[PDB]
Structure formats: C-alpha cells, structure tokens
C-alpha cells in the first residue's frame, strides 16, 4: 500500500513551484472543484498539510495535463450506460447529481425533486427533467488508501485522516491473515501494487518449489517464475514471496500464483484479527494505552523480521593500500573466532 | 567494522565486490563488502499499535494468559481497549465494525419462516446465511446499515456447546480472571483488525555512561549508533535555574560535557570511592578567550582584590 499510494501522490512543492513558506491559507483548504479529482481526506498531518494530496480513484489525466473524471449520460430522466469523461470547466457548465439518488430498475428517476450539485459549490433540489449527468459510484471522491476503511462515513474527517495515514505505516508480519471486514478495494489494490506475481498466460503447474514455479502454456511452451526470498526492502523490512498453487492445478491468465509481503490469498492483509473488549481496567490502559495478552507473544501472532545492512570498503591510501585481513594487530583469538581465512 | 551499539541478530548474506574481478566500482576503492544481519523481533511494551479508524496507542502491559478476563465459554480476550476515548474523538465507526466482526466470526442464520423480516428486505440473498469466520465486505458510503446489523446481532449461531455468548445489544458477561467474581455489568466484546506500526521501542531505548568523545569539540558524540549522549537544551537550563538549583546546573555544564581534565578525575573518584572533586573550567570558555585574543582585545581574568590571574595551566 505504501508504494502504491506513493506512486500516485500529487505534490505542490518542488523546483519551479512555490516554496513551503510561500504557501498561505488559500492554497491549502479544499476547493469545491476537488470532488472527483483530488481526495480531500488523505493528507500528511505534519507541516506539509494541504500541499501534498492524493489522486482520486477514478481520475485520469487528459493529454494536456488537466484531470478528468467519469460521468454517466442522462438525457431526460433516463440513465444511459455510456460514460463520458469531463474536465473541471465542463463539470462547471452543466448540472450533476449524486450517484446514491434512488433510481428505478427500468432507468428512470422516482422522486420528482432530486439533489443536484451546481456551480460555485451550491447544492439544491431540482426537478428530474433537466439533470445532465449522474456520477458513477459513491466512492468517486476518495483516494485508494481511504477506500479501505470500513464504515468510513461514520467517522469524523479529522480521525479519518489519521486512519488513512496509518495504513501507510504498517509492518508486514511473519504469517498474515486477511481481514474479516474489508471494503473490496484491497483485492485490486494488491493485484495492481505489482508485488504479487500474477500468471501471464494460462496453463498447468509442472514443478512448484519454494524458489521457483514452472508452468507450461497450452501450446506447449514453458515458463519459470523466480521468487525473491528475504531481500531487504528500503525501510528494513523483509520482502518475501511464497507460492499458493500446487502441482497439477489448472490456472488461468491473470490469476495470482505467488503472494508477496502483506498479502494472503491475493488480498491486502496488514494486521490480525484480535478479540477485543471495551472497558477500563485497573489503570493499565489509562490515556490511550493498550493491554495485550501473553498469547500474542506465545503464538508469535505479531512478530516481524528486520534486516539491517552494513557496508565497508577498502580504498587506496597514499601510504599503501588497505586490505581485508584476518590478522588484526594484537587481538586475542577468542575475539577473532568467528571469522574465516578471508 | 563492528556491530553498532544496539544491533544484534544473525548474518544471512554477504556480498563481496572487487575491482580486479571486472566489477564496476567507484573510483579509489578496491573491495566493498556488504553484510546483512537479520533479527526476528517480537511485541512488547513501548511498541505502537493501531486500528483502521485512527485509534492509535502504545502497549502498556502484557498480562499472562490467565489474568485476562474471559467469556463464559472460557476463551480469554486478546486485548483490552479503553472507553473514555471513543465519545471525545467521535470515531464511533470502530464500534460498529467491532459488532459486525463478531457477526462475521460466529456466522449467522436469519430465520426465513413467515417470509423475510422487514429489515431483511433490501439485504441481498447472498448474506442470509454464512458459515463461521466467513469474510464479508462493506463498501464506503454504502453497505451495512444499522437496522441490518441490529438484526444480524440477534440471529447468530451458538458455539460448539449450544451457548450464545453475546446478547442482543452486542455486550457479553465477562468474568474477572484476576479475582474470580463476575463483572457486575455486561461489557462490549468483538473482533477487530489491528495492525502494528513501525515505531518500535528497541530502536529508541539507549543509554550511555562514558564512551567516545568528539575530537574537535571535546563533547560526546550524537545519535544512537555512535553511543552518544542526550542534548540539554536551553529550556532545561531555564527550568533548572527556576528551582534555585545551582550545583546541578554547574555540574551538568562543566564536568560532564567538556572539562577535559575533570571528567577523568570524576571517573577515578567514583570508581575509587572518594569525594567528587571540584569542577574545573570548560573548554568553551578557553576557546572564547582565544578567539577574543586573536582579535587584539586584551582580556584577562582578575581576582577578587585586583591581583591578576592566568588560566594558562
């Protein structure tokens, strides 16, 4: 999730743009035209607030550099399945309605007066005989990160910001578990993050081993996918991949075959399912503390793996040349027990 | 190369690069060695946890398994939250999720006799029955409604012993495991998805009594990997002056930081048991005197009566 969200970030700082101290309070708060283009909830909570945003789910960029959003075509109380992409100005010059307004199965509105957003952020009731466009999905305005929070509409915006800014800080565990209550977005999020190996062309599994998977296509050609094991990530965690398929299993092109880190069965899994109780308890959980059972330490439900790297290099000095040697000056052999001859 | 102060673990991979082996290297070097050290961490105090709805927190205590309150069945709860924090922040959503979690964990079977109930009218038929621990979904700005969830909570399956642990409101009758008596009132219990943030304690705890000193400023090094000491900002200086504390401030500024003669003397006195000798004179002051004298300003330190003194040695 961290990488996927990092790739889509929109930054207002940088060379050629306004500095941190140039920014005022006019260029930070949400403008009414952000609906469907820049997610208004996800934003760093530090001093960079407002300057850094995230692209919405359905937004795509037109050739010139502006940001378009999808819409449905409504002619006269009739909803069509044609999808038309619009920029900011076209959305300004028309009338648009929410996607959760009731509709009839035939393709007609029911109530005479429907809710409609109009220019300058105004919203009002209007008869159904002149609504130009209707949105696509209720989640049209949220980022990818915030689309994975269940019951999002029940939380305050302030706490939802911290909720969306903490999934980008999780830690992959030793053996992960899929969440019991998800929002469906995580499947696409994982499969497009690219960290899960996905079969390119259909076939059957010939040899499956912890290091590689061999699959023969329909025409008889063979492919072998190698999987990275215990490779360091950038922040010190471990990037490990394991197969899920077994030999003789027919697979289809596009199906996941080897989940990466923080993934179980091809779904974005970041934490565990814990049995919780809501009650003060003799002061050990006063002011935002948490009491854990020793069962977690026992069954290693929450143990992770961290890999540090150390680098040394021998250069050519003007008095000679440094050399990796086993004969340190005047050091007892017990210190030098664990080295080899090299 | 030695393992820095704090690290540990097992070596898992060694990469060796040499210029004579046709490997491209930066100019001036011959051999470059990268050694990877891996360690399996656990959970403990100080580690930071968080749910999905921004209810972060820190671990406070890890009780033994038998101390945790347990349901009537006998399965102790895995984690205990606090309730004074929900109404203030208005992150009420987690509560809803918690309820739904239990409905998902034990599975439900809505009664279809006399037709579907009123609250099951819009509910899709895929969710009428569910096996235990079967996953569900809930899209944002859509999905489960309060009436549906309320109906679900009343139609949950019993456990293997023909008992329903939770009630209609969503609460349950816990038992105190530390004493033995049941709790007077029912408590909310459910299942929640909990992550583990990347602010671990073991990379913050750090101590130093006497280690390396910087060779330019004669002050102890900085950071943790260098075995350094802690900054003593001027606000602490004001706070110490406020109490009327004088000897503590002078000592924290003289024999602990940059008195090149005093520090060794105090170490010897402590390790031998004698009284701590008087502080010397900080190197910063002598640096200031040299900088002033280099500008042709004769600065000298007089005695109480008027007799001249020298700080040469």
């Amino acid at each position: 999730l961290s990488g996927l969200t990092h790739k889509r970030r929109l930054s207002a700082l940088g060379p050629g743009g306004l500095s941190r101290e140039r920014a005022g309070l006019e260029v930070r708060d949400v403008h009414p035209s952000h609906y469907g283009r820049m997610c208004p909830i996800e934003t760093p909570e530090g001093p960079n607030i407002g300057l850094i945003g995230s692209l919405s789910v359905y937004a795509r960029v037109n050739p010139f550099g502006f940001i378009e959003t999808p819409y449905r075509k409504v002619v006269d109380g009739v909803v069509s399945d044609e999808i038309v992409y619009l920029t900011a100005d076209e959305e300004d010059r028309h009338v648009v309605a929410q996607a959760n307004s009731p509709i009839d199965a035939d393709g007609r509105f029911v109530e005479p007066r429907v809710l409609v957003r109009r220019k300058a952020g105004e919203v009002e009731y209007v008869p159904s005989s002149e609504v130009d466009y209707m949105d696509v999905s209720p989640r049209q305005m949220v980022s990818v990160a915030t689309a994975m929070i269940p019951f999002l509409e029940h939380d305050d915006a302030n706490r939802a910001l911290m909720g969306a800014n903490m999934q980008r800080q999780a830690v992959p565990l030793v053996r992960s578990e899929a969440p019991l209550v998800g929002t469906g977005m995580e499947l696409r999020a994982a499969i497009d993050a690219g960290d899960v190996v996905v079969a390119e062309e259909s076939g059957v599994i010939e040899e499956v081993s912890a290091d590689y998977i061999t699959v023969m296509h329909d025409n008889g050609t063979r492919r072998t996918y190698r999987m990275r094991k215990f490779a360091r990530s950038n922040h010190g965690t471990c990037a490990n991949q394991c197969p899920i398929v077994d030999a003789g299993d027919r697979v289809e092109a596009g199906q996941v075959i080897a989940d990466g880190p923080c993934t179980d069965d091809g779904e974005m899994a970041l934490g565990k399912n814990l049995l919780v109780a809501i009650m003060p308890w003799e002061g050990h959980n006063y002011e935002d503390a948490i009491i854990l059972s020793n069962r977690l330490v026992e069954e290693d439900v929450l143990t992770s793996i961290h890999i540090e790297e150390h680098e040394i290099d021998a250069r050519d000095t003007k008095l000679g040349a440094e050399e990796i040697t086993r004969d340190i000056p005047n050091i007892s052999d017990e210190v030098l027990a664990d080295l080899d001859e090299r | 190369l030695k393992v820095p102060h704090g690290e540990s673990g097992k070596v898992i991979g060694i990469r060796v690069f040499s210029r004579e082996d046709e490997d491209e290297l930066p100019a001036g070097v011959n051999e470059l060695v990268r050694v990877y050290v891996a360690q399996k961490r656990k959970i403990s105090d100080g580690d930071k946890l968080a749910g999905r709805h921004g209810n972060k927190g820190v671990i406070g205590k890890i009780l033994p398994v038998e101390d945790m309150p347990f349901l009537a069945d006998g399965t102790p709860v895995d984690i205990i939250l606090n309730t004074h924090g929900v109404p203030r922040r208005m992150n009420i959503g987690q509560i809803l999720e918690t309820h739904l979690g239990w409905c998902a964990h034990s599975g439900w079977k809505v009664d279809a006799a006399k037709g579907v109930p009123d609250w099951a009218a819009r509910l899709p038929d895929e969710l009428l029955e569910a096996q235990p621990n079967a996953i569900v979904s809930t899209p944002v700005f859509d999905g489960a409604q309060e009436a549906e969830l309320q109906g679900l909570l009343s139609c949950t399956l019993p456990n293997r012993d023909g008992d329903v642990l939770v009630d209609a409101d969503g609460k349950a009758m816990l038992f105190d495991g530390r004493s033995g008596e049941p709790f007077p009132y029912p408590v909310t219990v459910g299942y929640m998805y909990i992550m583990k943030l990347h602010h671990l304690v073991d990379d913050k705890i750090h101590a130093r009594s006497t280690g390396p000193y910087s060779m330019i400023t004669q002050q102890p090094l900085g950071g943790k990997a260098q075995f350094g000491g802690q900054r003593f900002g001027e606000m602490e200086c004001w706070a110490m002056q406020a109490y009327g504390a004088a000897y503590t401030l002078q000592e924290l500024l003289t024999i602990k930081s940059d008195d090149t003669v005093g520090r060794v003397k105090v170490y010897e006195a402590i390790v031998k048991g004698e009284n701590i000798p008087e502080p010397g004179i900080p190197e910063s002051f002598k640096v200031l005197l040299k900088e002033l004298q280099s500008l042709c300003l004769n600065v000298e330190v007089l005695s109480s009566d008027g007799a001249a003194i020298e700080l040469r040695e």
Binding site: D192, V256 | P124
Partner: peptide
C-alpha cells in the same frame, strides 16, 4: 459474480448493484 480477478476468494458484500465500469488500471 462481481469479481473480475479469476480464482479470488468469494467475499459477499452489502451493496446496491453498481457496475458501469470497474476501477481502472491504478
């Protein structure tokens, strides 16, 4: 049903049928 990714675990969902298009290539 609504899933487009082959072989993924079924995940019953509370929703009103909505499918003009699926989420684009992220």
């Amino acid at each position: 049903s609504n899933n487009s990714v082959p072989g993924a675990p079924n995940r019953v969902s509370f929703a009103k049928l909505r499918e003009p298009l699926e989420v684009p290539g992220l």
